Structure formats: C-alpha cells, structure tokens
C-alpha cells in the first residue's frame with residue numbers, strides 16, 4: 504500500500520508549504536526589501552555577476568520551494584545565508600543593502616526557531632501522555 508512513500512511525500516508537502524510561507528510572509532515583508540525580491544539586474548548593476556559567484560534572491564527561492572528542491576532545513580538555510588553573504592561580499596558591512604539583507608536573514612531564523620520550540624514542546628507532551636497511559640494499566 505506504499506504508506507512509507509505517502510508519509511515522506513506528505514512531509515515534503517507540509518515543509519515546502521512552511522518554507523513558502525516564511526519567504527512570502529516574513530522575508531518579503533521586511534521594509535525596503537524590493538531589491539532582494541528578484542535577481543540582481545545586470546542592466547542596473549553591471550559589476551554584480553563578475554563579483555558574485557552564487558547569486559540568490561527571494562523569488563528564485565520561492566520557485567525552488569514550489570519544485571520541492573529543499574528537502575532539509577540546512578539546504579534551505581544555505582540559500583538564505585547567501586542573501587547576506589553576497590551583500591557583505593559585494594557592498595561591505597556598512598551598506599543599506601547589508602543592513603536589509605540582515606533583517607531578511609534574521610526573521611527567517613526567528614521564524615524557524617519559534618516553530619521548532621512549538622514542535623519540540625508538542626513532542627514532549629506526546630511522550631508524557633505515552634508514559635502516563637503505560638503507568639495506568641500497571642495500576
């Protein structure tokens with residue numbers, strides 16, 4: 504009956520959905536983030552792709568997510584971290600581009616963090632319950 508696939512596919516779907524929501528609801532809502540919503544346009548930044556080796560932006564990350572490219576937390580956080588890392592490399596730490604990439608990276612970390620609080624707590628509750636029941640038939 505392919506339970507095992509269905510369970511994994513199902514986990515994929517919920518994950519992508521979560522990632523898609525952090526991107527559009529979080530990272531794209533940072534004020535002054537417009538420039539991070541799309542790939543850096545050569546016509547307005549002709550040096551960009553001479554200095555930047557692995558470029559990324561929030562729209563390309565949405566596309567990846569829509570195609571289930573990110574199968575772990577770390578794979579996703581690798582592309583997110585490039586947002587800040589490419590801004591420091593191209594602009595340095597003093598720039599508004601760097602201040603804004605920082606806000607964007609920040610809220611993705613805060614959001615994934617608070618999520619995991621919630622999971623690891625639900626999980627501990629599940630284990631209490633499981634202990635409790637086993638403790639009751641013994642009595």
Ligand SMILES: CCOC(=O)Nc1cc(-c2ccc(C)c(NS(C)(=O)=O)c2)nn2c(C)nnc12
Pocket residue numbers: 537538539540541542543544545547548590593594600
């Ligand atoms: C100060 C000297 O440094 C830089 O030029 N910095 C950067 C400049 C721009 C940038 C400019 C102009 C426009 C119109 C856009 N929008 S688009 C259509 O290219 O997506 C983006 N992005 N950017 C990003 C990301 N990271 N750094 C920069």
